[PDB]
Coordinates of C-alpha atoms and ligand atoms in Angstrom, one line a residue:
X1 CA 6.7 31.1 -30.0
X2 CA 10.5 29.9 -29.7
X3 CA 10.9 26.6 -28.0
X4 CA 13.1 26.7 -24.3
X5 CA 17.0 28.0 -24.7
X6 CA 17.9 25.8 -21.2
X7 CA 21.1 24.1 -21.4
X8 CA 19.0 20.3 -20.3
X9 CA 16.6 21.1 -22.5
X10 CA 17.7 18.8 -25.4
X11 CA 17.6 16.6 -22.5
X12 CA 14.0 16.7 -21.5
X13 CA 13.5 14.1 -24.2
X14 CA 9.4 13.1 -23.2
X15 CA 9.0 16.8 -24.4
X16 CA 11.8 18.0 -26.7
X17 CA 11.6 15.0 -28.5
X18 CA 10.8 15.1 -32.3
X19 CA 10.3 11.6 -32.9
X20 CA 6.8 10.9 -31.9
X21 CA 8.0 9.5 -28.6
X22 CA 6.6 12.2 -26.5
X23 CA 4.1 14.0 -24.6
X24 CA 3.3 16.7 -27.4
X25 CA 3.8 19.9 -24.9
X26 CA 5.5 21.8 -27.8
X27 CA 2.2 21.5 -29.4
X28 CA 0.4 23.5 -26.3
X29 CA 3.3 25.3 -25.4
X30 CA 3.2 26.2 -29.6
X31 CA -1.2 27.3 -28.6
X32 CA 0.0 29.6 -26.4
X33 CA -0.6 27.6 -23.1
X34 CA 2.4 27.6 -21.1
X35 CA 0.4 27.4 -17.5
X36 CA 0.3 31.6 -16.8
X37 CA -2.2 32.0 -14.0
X38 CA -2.7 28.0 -12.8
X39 CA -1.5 27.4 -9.2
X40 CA 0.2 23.4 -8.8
X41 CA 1.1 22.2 -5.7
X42 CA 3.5 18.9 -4.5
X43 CA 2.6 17.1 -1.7
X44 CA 6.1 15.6 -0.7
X45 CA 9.0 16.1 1.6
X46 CA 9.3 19.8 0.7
X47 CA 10.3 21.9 -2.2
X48 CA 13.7 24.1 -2.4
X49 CA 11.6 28.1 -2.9
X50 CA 14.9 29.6 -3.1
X51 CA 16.3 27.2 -6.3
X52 CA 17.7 29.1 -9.2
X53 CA 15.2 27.5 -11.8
X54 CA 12.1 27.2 -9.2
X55 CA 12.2 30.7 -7.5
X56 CA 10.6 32.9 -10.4
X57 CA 7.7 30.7 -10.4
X58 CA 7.5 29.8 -6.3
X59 CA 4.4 30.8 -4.8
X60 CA 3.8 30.7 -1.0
X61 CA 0.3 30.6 -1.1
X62 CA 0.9 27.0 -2.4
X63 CA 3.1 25.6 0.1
X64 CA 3.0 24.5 3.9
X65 CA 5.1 22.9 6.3
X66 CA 2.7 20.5 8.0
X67 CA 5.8 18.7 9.4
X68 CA 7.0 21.7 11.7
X69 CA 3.7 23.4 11.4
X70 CA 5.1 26.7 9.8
X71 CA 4.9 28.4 6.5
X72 CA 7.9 27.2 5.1
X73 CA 8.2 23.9 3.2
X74 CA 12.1 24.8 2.8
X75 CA 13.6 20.6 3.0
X76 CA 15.7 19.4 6.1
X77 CA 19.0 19.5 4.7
X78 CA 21.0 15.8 5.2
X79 CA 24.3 14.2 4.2
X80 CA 22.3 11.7 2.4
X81 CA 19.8 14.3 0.6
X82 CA 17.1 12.3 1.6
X83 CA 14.4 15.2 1.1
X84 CA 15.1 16.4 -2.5
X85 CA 11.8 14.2 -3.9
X86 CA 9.8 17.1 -3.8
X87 CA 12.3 19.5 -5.5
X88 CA 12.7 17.1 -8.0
X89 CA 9.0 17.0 -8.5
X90 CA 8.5 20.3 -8.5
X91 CA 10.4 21.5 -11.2
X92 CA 8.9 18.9 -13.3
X93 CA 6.0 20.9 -13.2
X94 CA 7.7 24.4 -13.4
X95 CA 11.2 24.9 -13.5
X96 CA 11.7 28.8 -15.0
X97 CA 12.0 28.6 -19.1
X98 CA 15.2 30.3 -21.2
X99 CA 17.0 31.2 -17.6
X100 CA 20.4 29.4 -19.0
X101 CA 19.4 26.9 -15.6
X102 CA 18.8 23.2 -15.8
X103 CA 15.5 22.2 -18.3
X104 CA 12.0 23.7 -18.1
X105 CA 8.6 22.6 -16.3
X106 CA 5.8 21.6 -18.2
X107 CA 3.8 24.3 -17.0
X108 CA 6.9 27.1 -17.1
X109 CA 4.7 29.8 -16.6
X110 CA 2.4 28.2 -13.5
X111 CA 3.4 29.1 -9.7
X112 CA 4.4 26.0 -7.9
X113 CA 4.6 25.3 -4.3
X114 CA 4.9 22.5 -1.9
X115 CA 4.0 21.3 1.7
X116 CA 6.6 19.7 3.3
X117 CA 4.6 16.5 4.6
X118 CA 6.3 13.4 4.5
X119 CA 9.6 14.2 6.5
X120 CA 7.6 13.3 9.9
X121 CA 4.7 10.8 11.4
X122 CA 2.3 10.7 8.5
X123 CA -1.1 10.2 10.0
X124 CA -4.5 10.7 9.0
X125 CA -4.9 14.5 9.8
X126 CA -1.0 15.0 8.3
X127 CA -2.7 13.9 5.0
X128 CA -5.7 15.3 5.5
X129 CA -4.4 18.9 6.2
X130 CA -1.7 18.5 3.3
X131 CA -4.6 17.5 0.7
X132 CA -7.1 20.5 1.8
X133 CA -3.9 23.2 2.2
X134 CA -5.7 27.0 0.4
X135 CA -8.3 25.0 -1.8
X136 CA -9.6 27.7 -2.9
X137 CA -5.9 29.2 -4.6
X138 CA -4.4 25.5 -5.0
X139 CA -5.5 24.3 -8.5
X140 CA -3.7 21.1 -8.8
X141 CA -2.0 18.6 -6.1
X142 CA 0.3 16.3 -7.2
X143 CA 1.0 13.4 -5.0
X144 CA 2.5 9.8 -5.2
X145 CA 2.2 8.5 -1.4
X146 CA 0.2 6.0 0.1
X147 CA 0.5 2.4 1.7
X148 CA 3.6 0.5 1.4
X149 CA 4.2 -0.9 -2.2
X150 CA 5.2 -4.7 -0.1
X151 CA 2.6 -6.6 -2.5
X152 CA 0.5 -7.3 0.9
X153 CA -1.3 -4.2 2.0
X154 CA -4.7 -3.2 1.4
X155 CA -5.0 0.3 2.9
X156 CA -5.7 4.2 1.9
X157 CA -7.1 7.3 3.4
X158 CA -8.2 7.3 6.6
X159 CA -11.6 9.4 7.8
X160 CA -9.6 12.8 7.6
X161 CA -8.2 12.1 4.2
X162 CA -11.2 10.8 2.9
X163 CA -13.2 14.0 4.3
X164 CA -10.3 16.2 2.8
X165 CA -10.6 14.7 -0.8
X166 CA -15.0 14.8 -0.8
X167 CA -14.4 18.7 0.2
X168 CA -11.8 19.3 -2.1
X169 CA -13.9 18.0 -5.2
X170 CA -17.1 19.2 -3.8
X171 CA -16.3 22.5 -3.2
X172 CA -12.6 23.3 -3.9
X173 CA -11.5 25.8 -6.6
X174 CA -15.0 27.7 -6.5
X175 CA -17.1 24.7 -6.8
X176 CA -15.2 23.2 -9.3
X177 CA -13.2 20.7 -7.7
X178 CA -9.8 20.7 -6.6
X179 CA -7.6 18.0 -8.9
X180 CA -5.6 15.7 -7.3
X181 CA -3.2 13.8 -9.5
X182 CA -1.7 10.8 -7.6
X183 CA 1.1 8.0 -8.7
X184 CA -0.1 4.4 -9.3
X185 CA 2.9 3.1 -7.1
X186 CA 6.4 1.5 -7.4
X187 CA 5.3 -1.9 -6.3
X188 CA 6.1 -3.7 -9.4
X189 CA 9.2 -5.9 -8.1
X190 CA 6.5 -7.1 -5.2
X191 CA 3.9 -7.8 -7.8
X192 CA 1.8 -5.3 -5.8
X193 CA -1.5 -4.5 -7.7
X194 CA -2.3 -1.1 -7.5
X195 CA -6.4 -1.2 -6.6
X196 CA -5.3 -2.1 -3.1
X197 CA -4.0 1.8 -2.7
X198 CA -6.9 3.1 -1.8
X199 CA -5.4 6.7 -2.8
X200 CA -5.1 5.7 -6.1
X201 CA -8.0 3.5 -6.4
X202 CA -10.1 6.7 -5.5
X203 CA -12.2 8.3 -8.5
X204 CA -11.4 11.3 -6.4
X205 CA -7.5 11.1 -8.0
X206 CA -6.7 11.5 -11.1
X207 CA -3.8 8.3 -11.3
X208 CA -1.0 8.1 -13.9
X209 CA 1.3 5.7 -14.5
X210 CA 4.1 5.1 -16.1
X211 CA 6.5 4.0 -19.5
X212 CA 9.9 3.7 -20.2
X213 CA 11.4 5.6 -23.5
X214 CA 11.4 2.9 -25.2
X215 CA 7.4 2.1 -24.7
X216 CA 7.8 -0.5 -22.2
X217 CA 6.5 -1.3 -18.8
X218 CA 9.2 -0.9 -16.1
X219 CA 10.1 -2.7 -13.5
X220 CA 8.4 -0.6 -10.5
X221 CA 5.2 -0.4 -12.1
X222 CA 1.9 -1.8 -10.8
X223 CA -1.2 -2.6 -13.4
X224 CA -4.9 -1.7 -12.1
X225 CA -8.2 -0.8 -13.3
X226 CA -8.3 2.2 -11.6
X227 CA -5.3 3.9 -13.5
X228 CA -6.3 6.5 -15.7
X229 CA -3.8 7.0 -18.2
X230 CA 0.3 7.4 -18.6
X231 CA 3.4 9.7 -18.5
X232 CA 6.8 8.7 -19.8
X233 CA 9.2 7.7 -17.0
X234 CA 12.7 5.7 -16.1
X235 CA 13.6 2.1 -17.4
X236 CA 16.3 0.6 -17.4
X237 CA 20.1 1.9 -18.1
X238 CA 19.7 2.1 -21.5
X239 CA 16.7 4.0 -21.3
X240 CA 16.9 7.9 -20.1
X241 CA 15.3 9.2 -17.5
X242 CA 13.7 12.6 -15.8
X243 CA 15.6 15.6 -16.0
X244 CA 14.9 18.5 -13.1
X245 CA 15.5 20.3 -10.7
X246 CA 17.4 18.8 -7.5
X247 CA 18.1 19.5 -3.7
X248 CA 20.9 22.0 -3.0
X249 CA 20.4 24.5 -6.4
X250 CA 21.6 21.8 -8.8
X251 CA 20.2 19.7 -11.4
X252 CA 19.8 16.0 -11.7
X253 CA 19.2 13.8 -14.9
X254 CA 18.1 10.7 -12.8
X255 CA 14.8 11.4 -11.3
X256 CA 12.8 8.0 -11.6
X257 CA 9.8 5.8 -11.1
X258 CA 6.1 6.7 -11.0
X259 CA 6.7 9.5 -8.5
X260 CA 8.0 11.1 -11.3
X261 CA 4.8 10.2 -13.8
X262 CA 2.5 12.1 -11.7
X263 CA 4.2 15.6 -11.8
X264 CA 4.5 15.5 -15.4
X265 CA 0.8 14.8 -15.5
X266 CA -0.1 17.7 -13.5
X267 CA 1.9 20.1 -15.2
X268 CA 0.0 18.8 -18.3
X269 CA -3.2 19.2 -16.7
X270 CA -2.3 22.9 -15.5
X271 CA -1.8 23.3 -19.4
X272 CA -5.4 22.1 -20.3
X273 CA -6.7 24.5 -16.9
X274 CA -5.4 27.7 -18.4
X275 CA -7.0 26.9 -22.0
X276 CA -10.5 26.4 -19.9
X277 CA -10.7 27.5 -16.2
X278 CA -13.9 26.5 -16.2
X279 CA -13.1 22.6 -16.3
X280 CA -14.5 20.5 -13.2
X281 CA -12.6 17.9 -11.8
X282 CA -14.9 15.4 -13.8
X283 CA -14.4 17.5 -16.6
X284 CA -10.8 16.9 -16.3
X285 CA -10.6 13.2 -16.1
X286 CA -13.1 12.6 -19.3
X287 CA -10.4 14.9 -21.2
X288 CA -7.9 12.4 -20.7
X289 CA -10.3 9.6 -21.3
X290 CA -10.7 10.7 -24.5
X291 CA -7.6 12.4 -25.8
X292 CA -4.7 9.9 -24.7
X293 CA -2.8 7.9 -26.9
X294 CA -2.0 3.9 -27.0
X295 CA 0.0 4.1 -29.8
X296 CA 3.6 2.6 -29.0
X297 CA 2.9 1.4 -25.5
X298 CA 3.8 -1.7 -25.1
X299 CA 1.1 -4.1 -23.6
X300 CA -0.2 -7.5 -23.3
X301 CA -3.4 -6.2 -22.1
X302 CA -4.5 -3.7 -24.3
X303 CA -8.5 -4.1 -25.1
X304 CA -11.4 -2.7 -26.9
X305 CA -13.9 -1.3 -24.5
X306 CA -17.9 -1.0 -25.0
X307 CA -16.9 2.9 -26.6
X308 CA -14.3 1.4 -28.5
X309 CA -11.3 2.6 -27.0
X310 CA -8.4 0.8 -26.3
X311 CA -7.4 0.1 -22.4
X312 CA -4.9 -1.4 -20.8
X313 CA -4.1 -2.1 -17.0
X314 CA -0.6 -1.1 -17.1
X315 CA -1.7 2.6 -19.1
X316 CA -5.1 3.1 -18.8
X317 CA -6.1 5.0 -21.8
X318 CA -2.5 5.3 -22.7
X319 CA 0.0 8.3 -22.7
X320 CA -1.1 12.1 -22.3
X321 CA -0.9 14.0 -24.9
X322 CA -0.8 17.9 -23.9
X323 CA -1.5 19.1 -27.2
X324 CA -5.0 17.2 -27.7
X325 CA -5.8 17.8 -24.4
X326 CA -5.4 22.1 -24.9
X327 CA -7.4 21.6 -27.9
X328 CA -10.3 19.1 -27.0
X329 CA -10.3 21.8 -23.4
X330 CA -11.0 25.0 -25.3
X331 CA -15.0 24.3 -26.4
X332 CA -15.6 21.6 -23.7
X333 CA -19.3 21.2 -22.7
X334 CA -19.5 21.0 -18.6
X335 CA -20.4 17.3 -17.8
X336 CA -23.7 17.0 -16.2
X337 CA -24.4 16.6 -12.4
X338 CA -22.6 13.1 -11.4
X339 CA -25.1 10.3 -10.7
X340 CA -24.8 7.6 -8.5
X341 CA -26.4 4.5 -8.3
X342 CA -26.0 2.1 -5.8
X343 CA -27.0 -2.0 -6.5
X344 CA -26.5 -4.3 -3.9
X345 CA -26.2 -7.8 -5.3
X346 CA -26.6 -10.6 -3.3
X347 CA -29.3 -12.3 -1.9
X348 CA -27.3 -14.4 0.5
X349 CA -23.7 -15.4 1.0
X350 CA -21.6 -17.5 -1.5
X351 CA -19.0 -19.3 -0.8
X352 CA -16.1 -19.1 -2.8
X353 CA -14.2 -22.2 -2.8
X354 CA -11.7 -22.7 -6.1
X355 CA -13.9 -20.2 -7.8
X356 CA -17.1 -18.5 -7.2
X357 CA -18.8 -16.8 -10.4
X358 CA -21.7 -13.6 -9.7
X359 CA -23.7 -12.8 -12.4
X360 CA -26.3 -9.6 -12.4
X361 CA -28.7 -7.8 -14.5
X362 CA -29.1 -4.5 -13.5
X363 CA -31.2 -1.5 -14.9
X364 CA -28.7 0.9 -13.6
X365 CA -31.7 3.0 -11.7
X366 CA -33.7 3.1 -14.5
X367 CA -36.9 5.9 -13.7
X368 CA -35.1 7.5 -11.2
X369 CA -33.0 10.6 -10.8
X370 CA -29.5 8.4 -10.3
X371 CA -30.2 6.5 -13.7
X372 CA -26.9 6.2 -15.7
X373 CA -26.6 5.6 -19.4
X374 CA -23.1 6.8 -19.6
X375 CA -21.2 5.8 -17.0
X376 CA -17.7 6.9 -15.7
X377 CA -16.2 5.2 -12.6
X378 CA -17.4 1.7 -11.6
X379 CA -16.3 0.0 -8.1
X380 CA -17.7 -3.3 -6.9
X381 CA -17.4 -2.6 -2.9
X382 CA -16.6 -6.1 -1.7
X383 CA -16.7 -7.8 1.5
X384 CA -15.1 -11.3 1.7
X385 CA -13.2 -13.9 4.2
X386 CA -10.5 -16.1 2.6
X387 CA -7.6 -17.9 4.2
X388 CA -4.8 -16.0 1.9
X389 CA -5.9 -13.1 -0.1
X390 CA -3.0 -12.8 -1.9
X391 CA -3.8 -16.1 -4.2
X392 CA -7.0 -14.7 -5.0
X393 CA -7.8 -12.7 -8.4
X394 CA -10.9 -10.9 -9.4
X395 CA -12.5 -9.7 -12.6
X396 CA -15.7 -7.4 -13.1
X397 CA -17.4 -7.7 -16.4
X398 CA -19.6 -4.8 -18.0
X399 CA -22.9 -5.4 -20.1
X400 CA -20.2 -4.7 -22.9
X401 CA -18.4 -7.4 -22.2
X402 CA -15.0 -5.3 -20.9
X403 CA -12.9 -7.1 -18.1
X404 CA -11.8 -5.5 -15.4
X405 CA -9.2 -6.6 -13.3
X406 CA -10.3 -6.0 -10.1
X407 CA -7.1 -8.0 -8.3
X408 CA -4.0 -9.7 -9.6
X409 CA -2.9 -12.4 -7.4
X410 CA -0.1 -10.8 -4.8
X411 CA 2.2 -13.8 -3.8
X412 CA 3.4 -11.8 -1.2
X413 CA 0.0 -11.3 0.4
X414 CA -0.5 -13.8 2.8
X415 CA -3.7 -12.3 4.8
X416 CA -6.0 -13.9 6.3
X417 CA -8.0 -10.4 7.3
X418 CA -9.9 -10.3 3.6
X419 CA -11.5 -7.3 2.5
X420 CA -13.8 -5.0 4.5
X421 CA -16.1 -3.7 1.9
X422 CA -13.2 -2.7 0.0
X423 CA -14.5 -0.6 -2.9
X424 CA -12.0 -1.9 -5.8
X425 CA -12.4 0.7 -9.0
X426 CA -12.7 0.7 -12.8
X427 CA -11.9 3.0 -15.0
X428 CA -12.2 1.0 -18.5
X429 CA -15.9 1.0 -18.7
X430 CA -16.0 5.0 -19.0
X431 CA -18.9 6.1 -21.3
X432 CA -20.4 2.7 -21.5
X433 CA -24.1 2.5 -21.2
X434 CA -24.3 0.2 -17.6
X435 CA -27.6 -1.5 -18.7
X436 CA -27.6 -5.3 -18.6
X437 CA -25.3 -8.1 -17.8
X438 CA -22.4 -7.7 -14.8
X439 CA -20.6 -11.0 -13.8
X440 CA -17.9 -10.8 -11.1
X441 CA -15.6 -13.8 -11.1
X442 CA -13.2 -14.3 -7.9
X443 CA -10.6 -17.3 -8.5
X444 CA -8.3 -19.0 -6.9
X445 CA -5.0 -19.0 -8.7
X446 CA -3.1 -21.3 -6.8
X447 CA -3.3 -25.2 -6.4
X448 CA -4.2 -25.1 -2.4
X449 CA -7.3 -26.0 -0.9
X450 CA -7.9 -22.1 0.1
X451 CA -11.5 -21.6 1.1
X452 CA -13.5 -18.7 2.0
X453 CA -17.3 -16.5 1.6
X454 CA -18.3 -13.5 -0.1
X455 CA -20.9 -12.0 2.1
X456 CA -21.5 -8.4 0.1
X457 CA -21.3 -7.4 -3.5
X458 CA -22.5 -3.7 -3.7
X459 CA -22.2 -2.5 -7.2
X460 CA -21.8 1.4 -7.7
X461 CA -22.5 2.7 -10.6
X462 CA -21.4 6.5 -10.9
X463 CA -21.7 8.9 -14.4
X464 CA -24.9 10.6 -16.1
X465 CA -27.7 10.4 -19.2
X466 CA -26.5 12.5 -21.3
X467 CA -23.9 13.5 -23.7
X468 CA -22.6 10.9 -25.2
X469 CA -19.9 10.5 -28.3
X470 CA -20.2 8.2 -30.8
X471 CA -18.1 5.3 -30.4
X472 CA -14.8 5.4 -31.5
Ligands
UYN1 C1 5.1 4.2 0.5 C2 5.0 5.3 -0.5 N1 4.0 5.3 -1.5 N2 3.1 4.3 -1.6 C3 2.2 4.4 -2.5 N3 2.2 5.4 -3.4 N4 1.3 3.4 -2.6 C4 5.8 6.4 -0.5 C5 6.1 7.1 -1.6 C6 7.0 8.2 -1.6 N5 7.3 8.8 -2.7 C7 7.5 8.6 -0.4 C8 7.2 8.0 0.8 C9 7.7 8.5 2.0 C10 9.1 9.3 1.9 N6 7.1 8.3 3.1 N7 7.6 8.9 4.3 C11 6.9 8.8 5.4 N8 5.7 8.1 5.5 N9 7.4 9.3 6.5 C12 6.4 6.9 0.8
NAG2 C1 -18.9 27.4 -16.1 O1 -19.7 26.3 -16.3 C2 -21.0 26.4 -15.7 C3 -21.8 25.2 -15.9 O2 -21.9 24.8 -17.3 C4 -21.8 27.7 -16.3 O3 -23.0 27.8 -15.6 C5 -20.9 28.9 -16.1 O4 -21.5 30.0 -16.8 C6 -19.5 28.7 -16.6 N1 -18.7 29.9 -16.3 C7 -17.8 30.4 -17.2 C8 -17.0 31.6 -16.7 O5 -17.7 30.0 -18.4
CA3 CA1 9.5 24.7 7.9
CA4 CA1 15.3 26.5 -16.5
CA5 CA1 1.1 -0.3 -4.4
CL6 CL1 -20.1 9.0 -3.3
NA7 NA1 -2.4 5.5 7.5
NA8 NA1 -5.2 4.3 6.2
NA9 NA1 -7.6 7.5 -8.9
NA10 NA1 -14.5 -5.4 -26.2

């Protein structure tokens, strides 16, 4: 293997690099994994088929103009080149290799489509058809939409896209489970806190987010529990940025933010698909678990879980690392059947006040066929009045003592509407045994006399009984 002879290459420092600041694809490209056969498709505002570095790889079957209803995802062409986003994130994913054109995808060898969906009304069944386009061809969706990053909205999918991502997991890609791989979101500057996306807060997506060069966490970025782990993105002007493909057959070494995470991801995850097409969407997601890499990130946060690995809200489990993840792919065991377990927690209402503490000691369905000793994605699935939502912050703790951040406080939030059995996610208690101890603390981090109840406090438990790893 030679590495890529494009003219950007040098460029595409979060792969070319040789200085340990990077996502290791030389590694997997170096394994023989390049993406041959793997079929990625972005879920933007269209994707340019006919660009000299995207062409070779386009594939029709992975694109859709939901928009226009047509075939053709081709952008709307504007003085301002407002619909190049999903150019830009296409070709992170699979612009052509040694062409003499721009850099290389991560995937170089994967065919890459889009559907034009965002240049329009987005509504439920916009999203809904745009998530479930050829399920059964479509390996991988990359996506970085959802409610406005304000720092006050607490939204996601609607019936439609909800239905669309259960199918696609349940029985996209022959049973496997399509992947979604979804953006954390660019609400940093609005001190937006990413659990209240309910795209990203879904265990149904696969959520990235993001670091600058120098191992930082920029501006736009949002910190949650439900984030899974981290590609390398823009910073500040010091810092270099994404180099790939752009609108009108040219190439751009500005593409920024955590829309630009999230392709880099997939393209890293078609990688790991060709060296097992056998992996389930689960499968997927305890890959990265266990493969990506703290080291370098920068963090305030970063924690020892109950498995002793280290988490942090702004990275998850840290930065992909393509190379691990071909490896650790190639002999992977299919998970088990995915239990769930459902524990509702309170006996009446409590009122919440200046702080309200819940504490539970749960058997995590011991004797029956949803018992868990391993678990993988834990929500608490509140329901709750209070005067301004936005002051409140809430923490989930595990029998192993890891804290979740369930909420930051939002200073921009200012509702008074609550949450509506609002089904906030963890992903830092992965392979911990959910025996014992939960306590869920809700505060109120400001000095006003705020006031308010929680009336519901369902705890669900998802993962299996088998299988487990010694602790790291
Ligand atoms: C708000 C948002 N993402 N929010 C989130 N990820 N939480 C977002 C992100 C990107 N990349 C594009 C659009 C567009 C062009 N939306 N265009 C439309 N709706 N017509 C919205
Ligand atoms: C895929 O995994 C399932 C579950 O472990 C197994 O039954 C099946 O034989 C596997 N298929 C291939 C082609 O490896
Ligand atoms: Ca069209
Ligand atoms: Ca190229
Ligand atoms: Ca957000
Ligand atoms: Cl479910
Ligand atoms: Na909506
Ligand atoms: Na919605
Ligand atoms: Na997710
Ligand atoms: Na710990």
């Amino acid at each position: 293997y030679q590495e890529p002879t494009d003219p950007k290459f040098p460029q595409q420092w979060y792969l070319s690099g040789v200085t340990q600041r990077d996502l290791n694809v030389k590694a997997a490209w170096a394994q023989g994994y390049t993406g041959h056969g793997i079929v990625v498709s972005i879920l933007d505002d269209g994707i340019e088929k006919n660009h000299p570095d995207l062409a070779g790889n386009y594939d029709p079957g992975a694109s859709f103009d939901v928009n226009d209803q047509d075939p053709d995802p081709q952008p709307r062409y504007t003085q301002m080149n407002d619909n190049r986003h999903g150019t830009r994130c296409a070709g992170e994913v699979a612009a052509v290799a040694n062409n003499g054109v721009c850099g290389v995808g991560v995937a170089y060898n994967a065919r890459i489509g889009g559907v034009r969906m965002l240049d329009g009304e987005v509504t439920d069944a916009v999203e809904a058809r745009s998530l479930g386009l050829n399920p059964n061809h479509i390996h991988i969706y990359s996506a970085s939409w959802g409610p406005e990053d304000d720092g006050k909205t607490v939204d996601g999918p609607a019936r439609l896209a909800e239905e669309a991502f259960f199918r696609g997991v349940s029985q996209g890609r022959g049973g496997l489970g399509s992947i979604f791989v979804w953006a954390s979101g660019n609400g940093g500057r609005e001190h937006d806190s990413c659990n209240c996306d309910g795209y990203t807060n879904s265990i149904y997506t696969l959520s990235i987010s993001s670091a600058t060069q120098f191992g930082n966490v920029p501006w736009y970025s949002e910190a949650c529990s439900s984030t899974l782990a981290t590609t390398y993105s823009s910073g500040n002007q010091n810092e270099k940025q994404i180099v790939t493909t752009d609108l009108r057959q040219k190439c751009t070494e500005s593409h920024t933010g955590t829309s630009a995470s999230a392709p880099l991801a997939a393209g890293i995850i078609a990688l790991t698909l060709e060296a097992n097409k056998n992996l389930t969407w689960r499968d997927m997601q305890h890959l990265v678990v266990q493969t990506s890499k703290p080291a370098h990130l920068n963090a305030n946060d970063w924690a020892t879980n109950g498995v002793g690995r280290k988490v942090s809200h702004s990275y998850g489990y840290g930065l992909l690392d393509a190379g691990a993840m071909v490896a650790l792919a190639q002999n992977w065991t299919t998970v088990a059947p995915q239990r769930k377990c459902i524990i509702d927690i309170l006996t009446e209402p409590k009122d919440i006040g200046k702080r309200l503490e819940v504490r539970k000691t749960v058997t995590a369905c011991l004797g029956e066929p949803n018992h868990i000793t391993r678990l993988e994605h834990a929500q608490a699935r509140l329901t709750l009045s209070y005067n301004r939502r936005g002051d409140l912050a809430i923490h989930l703790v595990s029998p192993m003592g890891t804290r979740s951040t369930l909420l930051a406080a939002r200073p921009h939030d200012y509702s008074a509407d609550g949450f509506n059995d609002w089904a906030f996610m963890t992903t830092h208690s992965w392979d911990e045994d959910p025996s014992g101890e939960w306590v869920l603390e809700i505060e109120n981090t400001s000095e006003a006399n705020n006031y308010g109840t929680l009336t519901k406090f369902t705890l669900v438990l998802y993962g299996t009984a088998s299988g487990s790893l010694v602790p790291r």
